[PDB]
Amino acid sequence: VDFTGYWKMLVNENFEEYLRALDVNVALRKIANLLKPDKEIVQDGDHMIIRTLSTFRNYIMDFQVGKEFEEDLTGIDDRKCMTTVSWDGDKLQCVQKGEKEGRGWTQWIEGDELHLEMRVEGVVCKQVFKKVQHHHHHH
Ligand SMILES: CC1=C(/C=C/C(C)=C/C=C/C(C)=C/CO)C(C)(C)CCC1
Protein backbone atom coordinates (compact mmCIF):
# COMPACT_ATOMS: atom_id res chain seq x y z
CA VAL A 1 0.00 0.00 0.00
CA ASP A 2 1.05 3.61 -0.66
CA PHE A 3 -0.89 6.30 1.21
CA THR A 4 0.64 9.18 -0.76
CA GLY A 5 -1.99 11.65 -1.89
CA TYR A 6 -4.48 14.31 -0.88
CA TRP A 7 -7.66 13.23 0.89
CA LYS A 8 -10.78 15.16 1.83
CA MET A 9 -12.97 14.32 4.83
CA LEU A 10 -16.30 12.64 4.05
CA VAL A 11 -17.43 11.44 7.51
CA ASN A 12 -16.26 11.93 11.08
CA GLU A 13 -18.04 9.59 13.51
CA ASN A 14 -17.98 9.96 17.32
CA PHE A 15 -15.25 12.65 17.37
CA GLU A 16 -16.77 14.53 20.37
CA GLU A 17 -16.40 11.54 22.68
CA TYR A 18 -12.83 10.98 21.47
CA LEU A 19 -11.90 14.59 22.28
CA ARG A 20 -13.70 14.46 25.63
CA ALA A 21 -11.67 11.38 26.58
CA LEU A 22 -8.52 13.42 25.82
CA ASP A 23 -9.73 16.20 28.17
CA VAL A 24 -9.89 18.76 25.37
CA ASN A 25 -11.75 21.75 26.78
CA VAL A 26 -15.35 22.51 25.87
CA ALA A 27 -14.57 25.63 23.84
CA LEU A 28 -11.96 23.86 21.70
CA ARG A 29 -14.21 20.84 21.21
CA LYS A 30 -16.90 23.15 19.82
CA ILE A 31 -14.43 24.56 17.29
CA ALA A 32 -12.85 21.20 16.45
CA ASN A 33 -16.14 19.37 15.85
CA LEU A 34 -17.00 21.81 13.02
CA LEU A 35 -13.70 21.21 11.21
CA LYS A 36 -13.41 18.85 8.24
CA PRO A 37 -9.64 18.46 7.85
CA ASP A 38 -7.84 17.22 4.76
CA LYS A 39 -4.98 14.70 4.89
CA GLU A 40 -1.86 15.30 2.78
CA ILE A 41 0.36 12.22 2.95
CA VAL A 42 3.80 11.59 1.50
CA GLN A 43 5.17 8.06 1.89
CA ASP A 44 8.91 8.25 1.04
CA GLY A 45 10.39 4.84 1.69
CA ASP A 46 9.70 4.29 5.39
CA HIS A 47 9.69 8.06 6.05
CA MET A 48 6.00 8.95 6.41
CA ILE A 49 4.58 12.48 6.57
CA ILE A 50 0.88 12.79 7.46
CA ARG A 51 -0.35 16.40 7.45
CA THR A 52 -3.78 16.86 9.03
CA LEU A 53 -4.81 20.20 7.51
CA SER A 54 -7.65 22.45 8.66
CA THR A 55 -8.66 26.08 8.44
CA PHE A 56 -8.16 26.44 12.23
CA ARG A 57 -4.81 24.71 12.78
CA ASN A 58 -2.82 21.83 11.35
CA TYR A 59 -1.33 18.76 13.05
CA ILE A 60 1.79 17.39 11.37
CA MET A 61 3.19 13.88 11.81
CA ASP A 62 6.64 13.21 10.37
CA PHE A 63 8.22 9.92 11.41
CA GLN A 64 9.90 6.65 10.38
CA VAL A 65 7.64 3.60 10.22
CA GLY A 66 8.78 1.00 12.72
CA LYS A 67 10.78 3.40 14.92
CA GLU A 68 9.38 4.63 18.21
CA PHE A 69 9.45 8.42 18.63
CA GLU A 70 8.39 11.10 21.10
CA GLU A 71 5.13 12.48 19.64
CA ASP A 72 4.27 16.08 20.61
CA LEU A 73 0.46 16.46 20.59
CA THR A 74 0.48 20.24 21.13
CA GLY A 75 -2.66 21.73 19.62
CA ILE A 76 -4.71 18.59 20.34
CA ASP A 77 -4.47 17.65 24.03
CA ASP A 78 -1.02 19.02 24.82
CA ARG A 79 0.37 15.62 25.86
CA LYS A 80 3.41 13.69 24.66
CA CYS A 81 3.45 9.99 23.86
CA MET A 82 6.02 7.38 22.93
CA THR A 83 4.52 6.46 19.59
CA THR A 84 5.20 3.65 17.15
CA VAL A 85 3.59 3.37 13.71
CA SER A 86 4.00 -0.11 12.18
CA TRP A 87 2.86 -1.99 9.11
CA ASP A 88 0.36 -4.79 9.67
CA GLY A 89 -0.18 -6.12 6.14
CA ASP A 90 -1.86 -3.30 4.24
CA LYS A 91 -2.86 -1.42 7.42
CA LEU A 92 -0.86 1.10 9.40
CA GLN A 93 -1.12 0.57 13.18
CA CYS A 94 -0.19 3.31 15.65
CA VAL A 95 0.26 2.84 19.41
CA GLN A 96 0.63 6.06 21.43
CA LYS A 97 2.06 5.07 24.83
CA GLY A 98 1.42 7.63 27.52
CA GLU A 99 -0.97 8.81 30.18
CA LYS A 100 -4.12 7.59 28.42
CA GLU A 101 -4.80 3.87 28.16
CA GLY A 102 -5.52 2.32 24.79
CA ARG A 103 -4.47 5.36 22.75
CA GLY A 104 -3.71 4.82 19.08
CA TRP A 105 -5.16 4.47 15.60
CA THR A 106 -5.41 2.26 12.50
CA GLN A 107 -5.28 3.59 8.93
CA TRP A 108 -6.01 1.78 5.65
CA ILE A 109 -7.31 2.26 2.10
CA GLU A 110 -10.45 0.86 0.47
CA GLY A 111 -10.81 1.92 -3.17
CA ASP A 112 -10.86 5.74 -3.25
CA GLU A 113 -11.26 5.95 0.56
CA LEU A 114 -8.77 6.53 3.35
CA HIS A 115 -10.10 4.93 6.53
CA LEU A 116 -8.88 6.07 9.96
CA GLU A 117 -10.04 4.61 13.30
CA MET A 118 -8.81 6.64 16.30
CA ARG A 119 -9.00 5.16 19.80
CA VAL A 120 -8.45 6.21 23.41
CA GLU A 121 -9.75 4.81 26.71
CA GLY A 122 -12.15 2.47 24.91
CA VAL A 123 -13.67 5.23 22.76
CA VAL A 124 -13.69 4.72 18.99
CA CYS A 125 -13.84 7.54 16.41
CA LYS A 126 -14.04 6.61 12.71
CA GLN A 127 -13.11 8.94 9.85
CA VAL A 128 -13.31 8.34 6.10
CA PHE A 129 -11.68 10.57 3.50
CA LYS A 130 -12.03 10.55 -0.30
CA LYS A 131 -9.02 10.77 -2.58
CA VAL A 132 -9.03 14.15 -4.38
CA GLN A 133 -6.96 15.85 -7.08
CA HIS A 134 -7.56 19.62 -6.75
CA HIS A 135 -4.72 20.85 -4.61
CA HIS A 136 -4.13 24.12 -2.87
CA HIS A 137 -1.30 25.74 -1.04
CA HIS A 138 -0.85 25.29 2.69
CA HIS A 139 1.83 26.02 5.29
C1 LIG B 1 -8.49 18.54 18.42
C2 LIG B 1 -7.90 19.42 17.32
C3 LIG B 1 -7.46 18.92 16.18
C4 LIG B 1 -7.31 17.38 16.13
C5 LIG B 1 -6.45 16.72 15.32
C6 LIG B 1 -6.33 15.20 15.35
C7 LIG B 1 -7.14 14.38 16.32
C8 LIG B 1 -5.40 14.70 14.52
C9 LIG B 1 -5.12 13.22 14.34
C10 LIG B 1 -4.18 12.84 13.45
C11 LIG B 1 -3.95 11.40 13.09
C12 LIG B 1 -4.63 10.30 13.88
C13 LIG B 1 -3.23 11.19 11.98
C14 LIG B 1 -3.04 9.88 11.25
O1 LIG B 1 -3.79 10.10 10.03
C15 LIG B 1 -6.94 19.79 14.99
C16 LIG B 1 -5.41 19.80 14.99
C17 LIG B 1 -7.50 19.32 13.66
C18 LIG B 1 -7.38 21.23 15.17
C19 LIG B 1 -7.20 21.67 16.60
C20 LIG B 1 -7.96 20.90 17.69
UniProtKB/Swiss-Prot annotation:
UniProt-annotated stretches for the region Important for interaction with STRA6: 20-30
A single GO BP: lipid homeostasis
Organism superkingdom: Eukaryota
Record carries keyword Cytoplasm: yes
Pfam families per the UniProt record, alphabetical: Lipocalin
Record note on what altering residue 20 to A does: No effect on retinol binding. Abolishes interaction with STA6 and the ability to enhance STA6-mediated vitamin A uptake
Effect of residue 30 to A: No effect on retinol binding. Abolishes interaction with STA6 and the ability to enhance STA6-mediated vitamin A uptake
A single cellular component GO annotation: lipid droplet
Variant or mutagenesis effect after changing residue 29 to A: No effect on retinol binding. Abolishes interaction with STA6 and the ability to enhance STA6-mediated vitamin A uptake
Tissue expression as described in the entry: Detected in nearly all the tissues with higher expression in adult ovary, pancreas, pituitary gland and adrenal gland, and fetal liver.
Cited InterPro entries: Calycin, CRBP1, Fatty_acid-bd, ILBP, Lipocln_cytosolic_FA-bd_dom
Result of changing residue 57 to E: Decreases cellular retinol uptake and impairs retinol storage
The entry's keywords: Cytoplasm, Lipid droplet, Methylation, Retinol-binding, Transport, Vitamin A
UniProt GO MF annotations: all-trans-retinol binding; fatty acid binding; retinal binding; retinoid binding
Binding site for all-trans-retinol: 39, 61, 107
Quaternary structure and interacting proteins, as annotated: Interacts (only as retinol-free apoprotein) with STRA6.
Free-text comment about domains: Forms a beta-barrel structure that accommodates hydrophobic ligands in its interior.
Record function comment: Cytoplasmic retinol-binding protein. Accepts retinol from the transport protein STRA6, and thereby contributes to retinol uptake, storage and retinoid homeostasis.
Family named by the database record: Belongs to the calycin superfamily. Fatty-acid binding protein (FABP) family.
Protein's UniProt name: Retinol-binding protein 1
